[PDB]
Amino acid sequence: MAAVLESLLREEVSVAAVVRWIARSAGEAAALSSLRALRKEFVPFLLNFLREQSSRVLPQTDEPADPARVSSRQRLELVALVYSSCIAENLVPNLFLELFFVFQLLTARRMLESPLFQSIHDCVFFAVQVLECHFQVLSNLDKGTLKLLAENERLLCFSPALQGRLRAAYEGSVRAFHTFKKQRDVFYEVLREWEDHHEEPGWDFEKGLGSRIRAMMGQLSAACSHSHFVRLFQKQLLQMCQSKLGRLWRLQERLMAPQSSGGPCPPPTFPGCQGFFRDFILSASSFQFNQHLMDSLSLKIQELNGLALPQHEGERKQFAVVLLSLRLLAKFLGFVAFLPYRGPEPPPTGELQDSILALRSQVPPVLDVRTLLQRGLQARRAVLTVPWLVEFLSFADHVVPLLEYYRDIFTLLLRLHRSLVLSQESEGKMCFLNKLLLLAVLGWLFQIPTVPEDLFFLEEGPSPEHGLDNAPVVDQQLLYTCCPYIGELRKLLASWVSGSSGRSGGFMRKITPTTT
Amino acid sequence: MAAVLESLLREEVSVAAVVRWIAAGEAAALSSLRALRKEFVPFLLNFLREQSSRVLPQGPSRRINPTPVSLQEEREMLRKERSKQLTDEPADPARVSSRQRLELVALVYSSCIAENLVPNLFLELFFVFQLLTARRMLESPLFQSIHDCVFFAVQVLECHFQVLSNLDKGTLKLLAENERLLCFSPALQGRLRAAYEGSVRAFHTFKKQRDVFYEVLREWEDHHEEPGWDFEKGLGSRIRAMMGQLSAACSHSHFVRLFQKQLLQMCQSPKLGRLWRLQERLMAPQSSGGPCPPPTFPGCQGFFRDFILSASSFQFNQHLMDSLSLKIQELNGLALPQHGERKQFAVVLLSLRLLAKFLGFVAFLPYRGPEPPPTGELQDSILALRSQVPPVLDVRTLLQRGLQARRAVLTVPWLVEFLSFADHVVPLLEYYRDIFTLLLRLHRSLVLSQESEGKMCFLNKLLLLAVLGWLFQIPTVPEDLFFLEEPEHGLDNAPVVDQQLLYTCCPYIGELRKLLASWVSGSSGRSGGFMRKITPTTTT
Amino acid sequence: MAKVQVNNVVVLDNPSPFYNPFQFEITFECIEDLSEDLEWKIIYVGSAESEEYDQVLDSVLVGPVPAGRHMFVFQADAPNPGLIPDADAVGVTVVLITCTYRGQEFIRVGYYVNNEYTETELRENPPVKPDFSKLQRNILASNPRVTRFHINWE
Amino acid sequence: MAKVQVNNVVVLDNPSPFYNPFQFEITFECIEDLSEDLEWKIIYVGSAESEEYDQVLDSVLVGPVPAGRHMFVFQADAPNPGLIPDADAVGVTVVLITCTYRGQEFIRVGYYVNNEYTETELRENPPVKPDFSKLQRNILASNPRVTRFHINWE
Amino acid sequence: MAKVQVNNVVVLDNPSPFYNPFQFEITFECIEDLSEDLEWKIIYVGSAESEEYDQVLDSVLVGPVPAGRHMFVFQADAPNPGLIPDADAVGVTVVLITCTYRGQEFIRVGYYVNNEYTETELRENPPVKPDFSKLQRNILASNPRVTRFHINWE
């Protein structure tokens, strides 16, 4: 709880003044400086207060919305201005998670000086008012979202100008021994067996393939030819995992959708074909195999990061392939490397902690990430290197943030985040799509339970060539593929009109099953 | 290769000249054989071992105690069945074939040994003791008789008093009692006689795991000495289940701590005067492994080796590998005071050697392949694939820091032993080449005949030379490394090394005593020639 | 690991006319007793262009679930033809089955559905207005579809 | 009844050359304790033409024997080739094992011994003088002969 | 992984007087056929002081070994009493039995030897010089010490 909010609500200081005071580093400054002890606590206090207020409204005969039935106007306008100006100067870690919250507020249905949002109309008016300040971000979403958002009646009721602007924006559219051969034959047979039988119900991977794999590994260890097996494994993984007839594929895409309730920020999980190798590696339980795999993957990752991509201003498609391959390889390397230390218990504070830090800090990391990030960032090319680095750290354990080595990397990332302005194009000299991709991928990193939540807030302060940065290399398809969670805004919009007619709801009709 | 030997044999140059050259017309004459300087020592060595092959070896009222658990009748049947079928020679100086050539060869050998050009000193000494220990059967071949061999061995052995005076009582007793040296140099035997008379938070399941581990060890030490015992067959099931439970409970740190503490506590150390000496016979090392035996785990250290080989889990190895590295790093920097009597040095060294041994064994386990990379064109691919991963311990920096501030004796042993368990490809890498060349440079400088240069105790130099001479005969390290490659007062000055420590560091030194005892145990030509042969009996 | 596994799903009354209710028999086994009641849902895909045309046919909540295998029969009503656009009225569609624990989906079962006219002339020349009184719906039970997810069961 | 019973006799080190010593593993039985020493002898038959060529190889004395299933290994030297007749040296002959208690024997055991040349060219035409330096001794342990006596045990 | 292992060793003829030759019974198991002949040795440590009084008894070769398990009995002659120093001639000592393959030793077994006067007055106070006609040899078969080494076999 802070005294700044009610003070500003009661007409003491300008919103821009507090936004500059929070972002940077005559009596208005002195009055604001009297509450210096609450400067850091303003943002989470405001976010918790707003979340708690919506509990009355959010779903923890229908009446259409009416702009003339609002309870008040001035307080709502001030709150909306504060919220919009907090996003405009990047006071919050993840923009798309905040866009999901306003969209949820937009579809309310039923049920300090005074509690706010006492009626549905107030909530709808708030949602309309805040959304009006972010035309640029919405204009670059997919076609289906533009379809759904341009036909809704709430926007027409509360702001015909917004409906007209969105409607106009629609038109924009597109040496080895003999036994190695026998082992590779067995491996191909196992792959075919999984390719065929993994889909039918009742299948269990361990019970059906927990015997032949171990024997294969044992005989391979006896023959001592792991290098060829690892090379074949890596080649197969890279070749296979990546990848009217326009109706079958579109329909089938429903049946391979991710978890429905996991959005907008879900934990990492291998989708589809990539899920095969995870259980193979888990059930192998071999020391030599893992070491060879780590060496090969590290060498492959380091080799690909140094490609000199030619540039012209024709078209080029290699960028998507190299980026996706780098992402996959980094994810697998991160999963394998930190396997031993993935403990489910955080380290309690006290003298006992220092022993763990001393013990775990004297071994070098499997891949020097810090120098790679520092060298890359100096010569632009940030868009090529940031995503896979983010993927690598996503699988770390609880100790890693407490270690000294990675704190410098985290500080560098935080310093980079604050420079990613969206409106200030005149000085950025950077394309919009790259900004949107980098902001989305950085904003997802801070939501994982492993990273401490307070690291984003408690920092006093963070503070030349022509390369791959300026070219508009990122495509909407690439952005949606690398950011699978962006599309959940459309799914929430679709449910607005689907659950309208067939609103049964209750009468849960308990049913008791049977057993032999 | 033999041109230099022929020139030196026929009185053309001086031994000192060629010794200085390897390490005004004489310089011009020697410079005519410039391209053959590097091959002189190996050629001379091989020629010596070849000429030795003529003489050295190639390569009734009885009573019993029970243990609990007329002849005329048979003659007719026998006839029916048969019809139906129907001294040692004495040695003295006077029967030598030659003196000048033998003296020149012996002097060259001694000069080469003294200036530290040979790879190993003790191997050459063991070869001199073999040439001194035989009894039966270019311009011209050497060694027509045992006399020639005995005279050559005695001429070489004359100039090495200082090394011979620092071993234990037994070898000096038998060397002073020798029946043959009396014929060739009474003064040397009197000298060694005077020397002999002159010498004097955790979970509850961790308790169950610890109890199981303690129960397991109580099965090994009381049944590992009965014949027919097997480790993996008898214990390959309980250990895996306990280790899986530990991995499920994610409590590897405490178990690793207990394991390391127990290993350090037990593996050091747990009429009596006659029993202790008698017991040493049964625990003797391999009778044929010397003088350069391969690394092995004698005593109680072998239990942990089999335990690791049996467990084979990913999680356990990483924790052990980190903990041993931390313990090794901490112990190197201890500031041992120097001044009464100090004993902590022995404990520190014996701990460091064991920790380095176990870390080196665990770390290189995945890569210990059977074969080298046969070619020079495909090999660079594996070299590139291998050299990228950083090592588990910053060993090169530790060695460089240690030598910069004296402290030589406290670093070389455990570092040298750590490289022992390396695989076959290591020496080809870019990183370890600096360590190996630094070790070469250190080895060259140590000379036993000079003491004014600096201040190093004699036993320290002996220990360093003996340890460094054993690394280069390991089969994994290629032999061509030696020849092709071409401030404060502190710990290195105080006399901290004793005879007991030296004999405990290098057990292979004592094989010289075995060769002397073999001579006197063979007091006659017992049971020579053909031997009894027995056909085994088979059962089903 | 998942505490609940679905053994086999068997299709009933195939084929059947359009107005016939959907029927399924679900076989599943649970290793240990659960702490909350299991819920099931069925969604019909009206069209492939958008998710706005989905019908929520029914949802049931199973009673207390002890260890062991369990079997039960599902009954649900037919979809309303009015909400279905004509373009996707005749063709191929998919029906989905989902079960959630603690409000988290962890198994999704899909079946191909092909709707086609019984009569020959209607099959060759369907009318402009899709007649649902003469359409037969078949279930391709030969090719079931299953997809699983990792959830926090505790 | 016989207090001492010979259960089995096992022949060791067969086939072997001539100079190899006889090695018989024998297990015997005792109904009750024996108060005196058991004397064993090994007797080699020299010739079937006359009894003057038989030889005595070795004899042993067995300590006190309590009731049980005791066992010991009998060892005897090779026969001296200097007294065996030339016509009988090459061929097949018999060896005998007997037991004596208080100067009188109660059991006689006889095995059959083959002295056969190994190499075929010597087998076809053996020389006039037998050559013990390369001949071979074979024992046909599969067909032994047994004879039993009644003895004044008391 | 070693191929040939010993399974049981049993000592024979104990206790016995000093002049009796040593007796042993060894059985061993084999995994796959061996190429060259085996070799065995027996070493007697005369004096507990040092190794200069070691007496070799005998060394034999074992014929070709097929796969399976075998058994045989080893015999060796008595040691020479003249070379034993009179200080070690009464008390305890160690007897060594070793095996070598391809000229490499790979297993060693040893026993404790008890040499004591049978007559109690000589056991309480022994004579100034030995009398080997009254000494008895006892082998502690209950506590056999063994040790096995890893060697090259191919």
Side-chain angles (χ1 to χ4, degrees), chain E residues 2 7-8 12 20 22 31 34 42-43 52 66 70 92 100 106-107 119 125 130-131 133 147 150-151:
Chain E
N7 304 57
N8 188 8
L12 331 178
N20 283 160
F22 280 88
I31 277 304
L34 292 184
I42 288 183
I43 300 181
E52 288 74 326
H70 296 285
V92 317
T100 64
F106 79 104
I107 165 177
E119 294 191 316
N125 290 318
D131 184 356
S133 76
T147 300
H150 157 79
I151 85 155

PDB file of all heavy atoms in Angstrom, chain E residues 2 7-8 12 20 22 31 34 42-43 52 66 70 92 100 106-107 119 125 130-131 133 147 150-151:
ATOM      1  N   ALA E   2      38.305 -61.533 -15.365  1.00  0.00           N
ATOM      2  CA  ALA E   2      39.162 -62.706 -15.465  1.00  0.00           C
ATOM      3  C   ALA E   2      38.371 -63.912 -15.957  1.00  0.00           C
ATOM      4  O   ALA E   2      37.164 -64.026 -15.734  1.00  0.00           O
ATOM      5  CB  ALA E   2      39.801 -63.013 -14.111  1.00  0.00           C
ATOM      6  N   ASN E   7      37.833 -72.146  -7.281  1.00  0.00           N
ATOM      7  CA  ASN E   7      36.544 -72.254  -6.610  1.00  0.00           C
ATOM      8  C   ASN E   7      36.663 -72.839  -5.210  1.00  0.00           C
ATOM      9  O   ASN E   7      35.928 -72.430  -4.306  1.00  0.00           O
ATOM     10  CB  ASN E   7      35.588 -73.097  -7.455  1.00  0.00           C
ATOM     11  CG  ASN E   7      35.423 -72.553  -8.859  1.00  0.00           C
ATOM     12  OD1 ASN E   7      36.400 -72.388  -9.590  1.00  0.00           O
ATOM     13  ND2 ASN E   7      34.185 -72.270  -9.243  1.00  0.00           N
ATOM     14  N   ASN E   8      37.569 -73.792  -5.011  1.00  0.00           N
ATOM     15  CA  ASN E   8      37.783 -74.362  -3.690  1.00  0.00           C
ATOM     16  C   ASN E   8      39.172 -74.979  -3.633  1.00  0.00           C
ATOM     17  O   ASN E   8      39.627 -75.586  -4.604  1.00  0.00           O
ATOM     18  CB  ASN E   8      36.725 -75.415  -3.354  1.00  0.00           C
ATOM     19  CG  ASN E   8      36.804 -75.875  -1.915  1.00  0.00           C
ATOM     20  OD1 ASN E   8      37.543 -75.310  -1.111  1.00  0.00           O
ATOM     21  ND2 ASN E   8      36.040 -76.910  -1.583  1.00  0.00           N
ATOM     22  N   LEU E  12      45.520 -81.307   2.410  1.00  0.00           N
ATOM     23  CA  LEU E  12      45.555 -82.711   2.782  1.00  0.00           C
ATOM     24  C   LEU E  12      46.743 -82.985   3.693  1.00  0.00           C
ATOM     25  O   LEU E  12      47.737 -82.254   3.692  1.00  0.00           O
ATOM     26  CB  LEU E  12      45.638 -83.618   1.547  1.00  0.00           C
ATOM     27  CG  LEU E  12      45.012 -83.132   0.239  1.00  0.00           C
ATOM     28  CD1 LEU E  12      45.242 -84.155  -0.859  1.00  0.00           C
ATOM     29  CD2 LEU E  12      43.525 -82.885   0.416  1.00  0.00           C
ATOM     30  N   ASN E  20      57.300 -85.161   5.948  1.00  0.00           N
ATOM     31  CA  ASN E  20      56.309 -85.575   4.960  1.00  0.00           C
ATOM     32  C   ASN E  20      56.180 -84.521   3.866  1.00  0.00           C
ATOM     33  O   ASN E  20      56.169 -83.321   4.165  1.00  0.00           O
ATOM     34  CB  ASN E  20      54.956 -85.818   5.617  1.00  0.00           C
ATOM     35  CG  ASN E  20      54.903 -87.132   6.361  1.00  0.00           C
ATOM     36  OD1 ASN E  20      54.059 -87.332   7.231  1.00  0.00           O
ATOM     37  ND2 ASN E  20      55.813 -88.038   6.024  1.00  0.00           N
ATOM     38  N   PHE E  22      54.486 -82.061   1.019  1.00  0.00           N
ATOM     39  CA  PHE E  22      53.251 -81.286   1.027  1.00  0.00           C
ATOM     40  C   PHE E  22      52.214 -81.883   0.079  1.00  0.00           C
ATOM     41  O   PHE E  22      52.545 -82.444  -0.969  1.00  0.00           O
ATOM     42  CB  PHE E  22      53.529 -79.836   0.634  1.00  0.00           C
ATOM     43  CG  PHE E  22      54.073 -78.998   1.751  1.00  0.00           C
ATOM     44  CD1 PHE E  22      55.433 -78.931   1.984  1.00  0.00           C
ATOM     45  CD2 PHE E  22      53.222 -78.275   2.567  1.00  0.00           C
ATOM     46  CE1 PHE E  22      55.935 -78.158   3.009  1.00  0.00           C
ATOM     47  CE2 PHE E  22      53.719 -77.501   3.593  1.00  0.00           C
ATOM     48  CZ  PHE E  22      55.077 -77.442   3.814  1.00  0.00           C
ATOM     49  N   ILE E  31      36.140 -70.454 -18.348  1.00  0.00           N
ATOM     50  CA  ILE E  31      35.044 -69.934 -19.159  1.00  0.00           C
ATOM     51  C   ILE E  31      35.196 -70.364 -20.611  1.00  0.00           C
ATOM     52  O   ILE E  31      34.244 -70.852 -21.232  1.00  0.00           O
ATOM     53  CB  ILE E  31      34.964 -68.404 -19.023  1.00  0.00           C
ATOM     54  CG1 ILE E  31      34.190 -68.023 -17.759  1.00  0.00           C
ATOM     55  CG2 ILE E  31      34.313 -67.787 -20.249  1.00  0.00           C
ATOM     56  CD1 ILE E  31      32.808 -68.628 -17.689  1.00  0.00           C
ATOM     57  N   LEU E  34      41.754 -72.348 -23.247  1.00  0.00           N
ATOM     58  CA  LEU E  34      43.043 -71.687 -23.118  1.00  0.00           C
ATOM     59  C   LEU E  34      43.979 -72.153 -24.224  1.00  0.00           C
ATOM     60  O   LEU E  34      43.881 -73.289 -24.697  1.00  0.00           O
ATOM     61  CB  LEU E  34      43.666 -71.972 -21.751  1.00  0.00           C
ATOM     62  CG  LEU E  34      42.952 -71.347 -20.550  1.00  0.00           C
ATOM     63  CD1 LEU E  34      43.724 -71.609 -19.267  1.00  0.00           C
ATOM     64  CD2 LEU E  34      42.752 -69.858 -20.764  1.00  0.00           C
ATOM     65  N   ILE E  42      55.296 -73.320  -5.912  1.00  0.00           N
ATOM     66  CA  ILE E  42      55.169 -73.356  -4.460  1.00  0.00           C
ATOM     67  C   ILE E  42      56.454 -72.803  -3.861  1.00  0.00           C
ATOM     68  O   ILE E  42      57.550 -73.242  -4.225  1.00  0.00           O
ATOM     69  CB  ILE E  42      54.894 -74.778  -3.938  1.00  0.00           C
ATOM     70  CG1 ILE E  42      53.470 -75.207  -4.283  1.00  0.00           C
ATOM     71  CG2 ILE E  42      55.107 -74.848  -2.440  1.00  0.00           C
ATOM     72  CD1 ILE E  42      53.098 -76.565  -3.736  1.00  0.00           C
ATOM     73  N   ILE E  43      56.323 -71.845  -2.946  1.00  0.00           N
ATOM     74  CA  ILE E  43      57.464 -71.185  -2.324  1.00  0.00           C
ATOM     75  C   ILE E  43      57.338 -71.315  -0.814  1.00  0.00           C
ATOM     76  O   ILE E  43      56.264 -71.074  -0.252  1.00  0.00           O
ATOM     77  CB  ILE E  43      57.555 -69.704  -2.736  1.00  0.00           C
ATOM     78  CG1 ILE E  43      57.700 -69.583  -4.251  1.00  0.00           C
ATOM     79  CG2 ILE E  43      58.723 -69.031  -2.042  1.00  0.00           C
ATOM     80  CD1 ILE E  43      57.823 -68.156  -4.737  1.00  0.00           C
ATOM     81  N   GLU E  52      65.977 -63.927   1.533  1.00  0.00           N
ATOM     82  CA  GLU E  52      67.173 -64.617   1.064  1.00  0.00           C
ATOM     83  C   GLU E  52      67.136 -66.114   1.336  1.00  0.00           C
ATOM     84  O   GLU E  52      67.935 -66.855   0.756  1.00  0.00           O
ATOM     85  CB  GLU E  52      68.407 -63.991   1.710  1.00  0.00           C
ATOM     86  CG  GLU E  52      68.753 -62.599   1.187  1.00  0.00           C
ATOM     87  CD  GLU E  52      67.818 -61.505   1.683  1.00  0.00           C
ATOM     88  OE1 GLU E  52      66.615 -61.769   1.872  1.00  0.00           O
ATOM     89  OE2 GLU E  52      68.282 -60.362   1.857  1.00  0.00           O
ATOM     90  N   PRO E  66      40.060 -77.511 -21.649  1.00  0.00           N
ATOM     91  CA  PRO E  66      38.892 -77.133 -22.442  1.00  0.00           C
ATOM     92  C   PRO E  66      37.947 -76.348 -21.548  1.00  0.00           C
ATOM     93  O   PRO E  66      38.205 -76.215 -20.351  1.00  0.00           O
ATOM     94  CB  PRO E  66      38.266 -78.475 -22.835  1.00  0.00           C
ATOM     95  CG  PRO E  66      39.135 -79.543 -22.248  1.00  0.00           C
ATOM     96  CD  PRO E  66      39.944 -78.901 -21.170  1.00  0.00           C
ATOM     97  N   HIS E  70      37.606 -78.177 -13.728  1.00  0.00           N
ATOM     98  CA  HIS E  70      38.510 -79.309 -13.571  1.00  0.00           C
ATOM     99  C   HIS E  70      38.959 -79.419 -12.123  1.00  0.00           C
ATOM    100  O   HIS E  70      38.683 -78.549 -11.293  1.00  0.00           O
ATOM    101  CB  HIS E  70      39.754 -79.198 -14.467  1.00  0.00           C
ATOM    102  CG  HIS E  70      39.464 -79.228 -15.935  1.00  0.00           C
ATOM    103  ND1 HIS E  70      39.128 -80.381 -16.610  1.00  0.00           N
ATOM    104  CD2 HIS E  70      39.467 -78.240 -16.859  1.00  0.00           C
ATOM    105  CE1 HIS E  70      38.933 -80.102 -17.886  1.00  0.00           C
ATOM    106  NE2 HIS E  70      39.132 -78.808 -18.063  1.00  0.00           N
ATOM    107  N   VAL E  92      56.265 -69.656  13.717  1.00  0.00           N
ATOM    108  CA  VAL E  92      55.295 -69.577  12.633  1.00  0.00           C
ATOM    109  C   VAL E  92      55.990 -69.043  11.391  1.00  0.00           C
ATOM    110  O   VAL E  92      57.036 -68.391  11.471  1.00  0.00           O
ATOM    111  CB  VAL E  92      54.083 -68.692  12.998  1.00  0.00           C
ATOM    112  CG1 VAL E  92      53.608 -68.985  14.412  1.00  0.00           C
ATOM    113  CG2 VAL E  92      54.433 -67.221  12.846  1.00  0.00           C
ATOM    114  N   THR E 100      51.094 -68.769 -12.646  1.00  0.00           N
ATOM    115  CA  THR E 100      51.548 -67.885 -13.708  1.00  0.00           C
ATOM    116  C   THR E 100      50.969 -68.344 -15.036  1.00  0.00           C
ATOM    117  O   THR E 100      50.828 -69.543 -15.290  1.00  0.00           O
ATOM    118  CB  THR E 100      53.079 -67.843 -13.810  1.00  0.00           C
ATOM    119  OG1 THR E 100      53.573 -69.139 -14.167  1.00  0.00           O
ATOM    120  CG2 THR E 100      53.693 -67.420 -12.487  1.00  0.00           C
ATOM    121  N   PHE E 106      49.168 -64.077 -11.756  1.00  0.00           N
ATOM    122  CA  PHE E 106      47.848 -63.468 -11.690  1.00  0.00           C
ATOM    123  C   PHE E 106      47.026 -63.857 -10.468  1.00  0.00           C
ATOM    124  O   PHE E 106      45.902 -63.362 -10.327  1.00  0.00           O
ATOM    125  CB  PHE E 106      47.047 -63.799 -12.959  1.00  0.00           C
ATOM    126  CG  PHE E 106      46.445 -65.172 -12.960  1.00  0.00           C
ATOM    127  CD1 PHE E 106      45.093 -65.349 -12.735  1.00  0.00           C
ATOM    128  CD2 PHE E 106      47.226 -66.285 -13.212  1.00  0.00           C
ATOM    129  CE1 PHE E 106      44.533 -66.608 -12.746  1.00  0.00           C
ATOM    130  CE2 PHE E 106      46.672 -67.548 -13.222  1.00  0.00           C
ATOM    131  CZ  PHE E 106      45.324 -67.710 -12.990  1.00  0.00           C
ATOM    132  N   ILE E 107      47.534 -64.714  -9.587  1.00  0.00           N
ATOM    133  CA  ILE E 107      46.825 -65.046  -8.354  1.00  0.00           C
ATOM    134  C   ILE E 107      47.818 -65.662  -7.382  1.00  0.00           C
ATOM    135  O   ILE E 107      48.672 -66.463  -7.770  1.00  0.00           O
ATOM    136  CB  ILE E 107      45.631 -65.991  -8.625  1.00  0.00           C
ATOM    137  CG1 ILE E 107      45.136 -66.617  -7.323  1.00  0.00           C
ATOM    138  CG2 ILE E 107      46.028 -67.073  -9.602  1.00  0.00           C
ATOM    139  CD1 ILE E 107      43.925 -67.489  -7.493  1.00  0.00           C
ATOM    140  N   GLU E 119      56.287 -83.151  21.882  1.00  0.00           N
ATOM    141  CA  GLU E 119      56.580 -83.407  23.298  1.00  0.00           C
ATOM    142  C   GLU E 119      56.480 -82.112  24.124  1.00  0.00           C
ATOM    143  O   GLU E 119      57.165 -81.127  23.841  1.00  0.00           O
ATOM    144  CB  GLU E 119      57.967 -84.061  23.444  1.00  0.00           C
ATOM    145  CG  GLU E 119      57.996 -85.464  22.814  1.00  0.00           C
ATOM    146  CD  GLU E 119      59.256 -86.274  23.168  1.00  0.00           C
ATOM    147  OE1 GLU E 119      60.379 -85.722  23.140  1.00  0.00           O
ATOM    148  OE2 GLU E 119      59.129 -87.490  23.427  1.00  0.00           O
ATOM    149  N   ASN E 125      60.202 -75.756  26.833  1.00  0.00           N
ATOM    150  CA  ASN E 125      61.607 -75.346  26.768  1.00  0.00           C
ATOM    151  C   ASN E 125      62.286 -76.151  25.650  1.00  0.00           C
ATOM    152  O   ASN E 125      62.605 -77.322  25.847  1.00  0.00           O
ATOM    153  CB  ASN E 125      62.302 -75.577  28.102  1.00  0.00           C
ATOM    154  CG  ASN E 125      61.823 -74.624  29.179  1.00  0.00           C
ATOM    155  OD1 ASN E 125      61.637 -73.434  28.931  1.00  0.00           O
ATOM    156  ND2 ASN E 125      61.622 -75.144  30.385  1.00  0.00           N
ATOM    157  N   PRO E 130      67.706 -77.525  16.621  1.00  0.00           N
ATOM    158  CA  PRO E 130      66.554 -78.337  16.230  1.00  0.00           C
ATOM    159  C   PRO E 130      66.781 -79.857  16.220  1.00  0.00           C
ATOM    160  O   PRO E 130      67.875 -80.333  15.915  1.00  0.00           O
ATOM    161  CB  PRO E 130      66.168 -77.867  14.824  1.00  0.00           C
ATOM    162  CG  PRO E 130      66.661 -76.425  14.782  1.00  0.00           C
ATOM    163  CD  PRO E 130      67.923 -76.467  15.637  1.00  0.00           C
ATOM    164  N   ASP E 131      65.708 -80.618  16.442  1.00  0.00           N
ATOM    165  CA  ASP E 131      65.623 -82.045  16.112  1.00  0.00           C
ATOM    166  C   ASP E 131      64.394 -82.294  15.223  1.00  0.00           C
ATOM    167  O   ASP E 131      63.272 -82.480  15.700  1.00  0.00           O
ATOM    168  CB  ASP E 131      65.625 -82.911  17.385  1.00  0.00           C
ATOM    169  CG  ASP E 131      65.644 -84.424  17.099  1.00  0.00           C
ATOM    170  OD1 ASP E 131      65.588 -84.847  15.918  1.00  0.00           O
ATOM    171  OD2 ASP E 131      65.751 -85.203  18.072  1.00  0.00           O
ATOM    172  N   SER E 133      63.299 -84.768  13.770  1.00  0.00           N
ATOM    173  CA  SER E 133      62.581 -86.022  13.943  1.00  0.00           C
ATOM    174  C   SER E 133      61.413 -85.910  14.910  1.00  0.00           C
ATOM    175  O   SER E 133      60.578 -86.821  14.958  1.00  0.00           O
ATOM    176  CB  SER E 133      63.535 -87.114  14.436  1.00  0.00           C
ATOM    177  OG  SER E 133      63.832 -86.942  15.810  1.00  0.00           O
ATOM    178  N   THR E 147      44.732 -63.137  -3.020  1.00  0.00           N
ATOM    179  CA  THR E 147      44.784 -61.829  -3.660  1.00  0.00           C
ATOM    180  C   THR E 147      44.906 -62.052  -5.158  1.00  0.00           C
ATOM    181  O   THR E 147      45.734 -62.856  -5.596  1.00  0.00           O
ATOM    182  CB  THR E 147      45.962 -60.997  -3.144  1.00  0.00           C
ATOM    183  OG1 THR E 147      45.825 -60.796  -1.733  1.00  0.00           O
ATOM    184  CG2 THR E 147      45.982 -59.645  -3.819  1.00  0.00           C
ATOM    185  N   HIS E 150      44.765 -58.134 -11.960  1.00  0.00           N
ATOM    186  CA  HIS E 150      44.240 -58.027 -13.313  1.00  0.00           C
ATOM    187  C   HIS E 150      45.389 -58.012 -14.313  1.00  0.00           C
ATOM    188  O   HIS E 150      46.278 -57.161 -14.237  1.00  0.00           O
ATOM    189  CB  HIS E 150      43.394 -56.766 -13.460  1.00  0.00           C
ATOM    190  CG  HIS E 150      43.276 -56.281 -14.870  1.00  0.00           C
ATOM    191  ND1 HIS E 150      42.420 -56.855 -15.786  1.00  0.00           N
ATOM    192  CD2 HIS E 150      43.908 -55.277 -15.523  1.00  0.00           C
ATOM    193  CE1 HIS E 150      42.529 -56.225 -16.941  1.00  0.00           C
ATOM    194  NE2 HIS E 150      43.425 -55.264 -16.809  1.00  0.00           N
ATOM    195  N   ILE E 151      45.370 -58.961 -15.250  1.00  0.00           N
ATOM    196  CA  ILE E 151      46.433 -59.121 -16.232  1.00  0.00           C
ATOM    197  C   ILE E 151      45.820 -59.200 -17.624  1.00  0.00           C
ATOM    198  O   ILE E 151      44.601 -59.213 -17.794  1.00  0.00           O
ATOM    199  CB  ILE E 151      47.304 -60.362 -15.954  1.00  0.00           C
ATOM    200  CG1 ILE E 151      46.668 -61.612 -16.562  1.00  0.00           C
ATOM    201  CG2 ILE E 151      47.520 -60.547 -14.463  1.00  0.00           C
ATOM    202  CD1 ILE E 151      47.659 -62.704 -16.867  1.00  0.00           C
TER     203      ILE E 151
END
